[model samples]
Target: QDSTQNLIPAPPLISVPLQPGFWTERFQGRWFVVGLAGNAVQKERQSRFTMYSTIYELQEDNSYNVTSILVRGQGCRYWIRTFVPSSRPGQFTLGNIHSYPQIQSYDVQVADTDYDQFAMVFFQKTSENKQYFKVTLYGRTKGLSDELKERFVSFAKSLGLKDNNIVFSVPTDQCIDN
Candidate 1:
């Protein structure tokens, strides 16, 4: 299996527009999880590589706890992801490792100024159109104060974010809090 990938930090980019009202009105009031993509490498067992999705939760310590979100095809149902401090620091482990017998693994890092928020950077090593991964951010919208929203939008747009990739964690499940 390919196990050489690591999570890394994203670099600064040109500024862009942030449609906060739309994101807040739609994606706020709930838990926000961020994920980063890892590079794909040649595997010993199979030709295809499996990637893992790391999950996180908002906290008050200016850092979020890494958690599991049941990503299939990584040869496991649970994986942990954590962010570290540093400018463009590489991916750090979150104390959870699930091995896939015939799949590849994605190593990632989670970094933020605060636990409740930060950006997700990933590498697209094996994509058809191979390119360096970029960092993205996610957070709960409902609880964020108006002032905070303004500031978050400003920060998000500063990264040249064109559109927010907002999706509900559980679309059909009734258990909304995780």
Candidate 2:
């Protein structure tokens, strides 16, 4: 018998989107990062107003191609190209050998979206001894309203993140591609 049998099993993770079919064609477009949560990489640099943006386009296979540009310290741009396959209406896998070296896979979920203004994405990676979670807020426009920011904060909190840990990324007038 296992010695840990008496320990209570942790509750299951809540499903993103809280529902299915929440993703739609209207979601195809460029989204600017407005708010972010989870992990030191996203939270720590958030206050500095890091520059980041992503573009989503429909693919022939009904999947999507994503091109992301993240500006690090002093306008150092990093580019990542990935494909979001059509596994389910609101769920998929995100793979990037360069970005996440030790990461075997990432479970991506749409979490919530309006298809017009704002969207929230949730990502989780579970390993043998560790787990990582990430949540990103995407806005149709570079500037997001106070109401939208509040909504994203609430969602992040539900994931067991503190409000102080969440960082709001600022949009920049210029980004260096070269």
Candidate 3:
């Protein structure tokens, strides 16, 4: 047995995941972005990102067919992503092997979730031979607890992020949901 593995020290996690199928269907449907932290997350950009909404459309294979809606000056802008499950249940990758280099690779994990109130996610992206990390906090509502916000920052620090970078979205009504 590779018992030596346990003897070696392990760094603390960026965070841990809730069990697979931990109310899986309940995790989907509707989500509101509560917080964000990552590269190029400038103060000026924060306002533009408030109260965006997401669709965590679950695939038959347990991957997520994702869509997020954000509002710009006068129109609703959107993005699509696919998180393909890994050999392990709580982990995922951005796309299939056929996805091109630009969106080529990512390490996506459900770092934490309650399936009722909040979900904090970890996404590490590689583009142009450069690496970037995007950490997220999604909630069933427009807001969540400060303790949970603290948890998000703690997780972000594990990915080399800092306090100034963590931002809770200001609540908004436009383009959120009915």
TM-score of 2: 0.73
**Which ten-residue region of model 1 has the weakest summed lDDT?**
21-30
2 or 3, which is superior by lDDT?
Answer: 3
lDDT of each prediction vs. the true structure? 0.32, 0.61, 0.62
Per-prediction TM-score to the true structure, in the order listed? 0.33, 0.73, 0.73
How displaced is residue 33 in candidate 1, in Å?
Answer: 3.2
Off by over 4 Å in 1: 1-31, 34-65, 70-78, 81-112, 115-129, 132-142, 146-150, 164-176
Residues 5-26 of candidate 2 have per-residue lDDT tens digits of 2211111235456335555466
Q: Report the C-alpha lDDT of model 1 over 149-175, residue by residue, as the tens digit.
A: 344334433333322321112221222
Query: For residues 1-178, could you state the per-residue lDDT of candidate 3 as single tens digits?
Result: 1221211111122344544555456657677777776553433434434657767678886667767676767876667677565556555665453466574355566676666768887765555555555577878775587777777778777766765555767776566662
Which one is best on lDDT? 3
Off by over 4 Å in 2: 1-14, 18-20, 45-49, 72-78, 95-101, 176-178
RMSD, model 1, all Cα superposed? 11.4
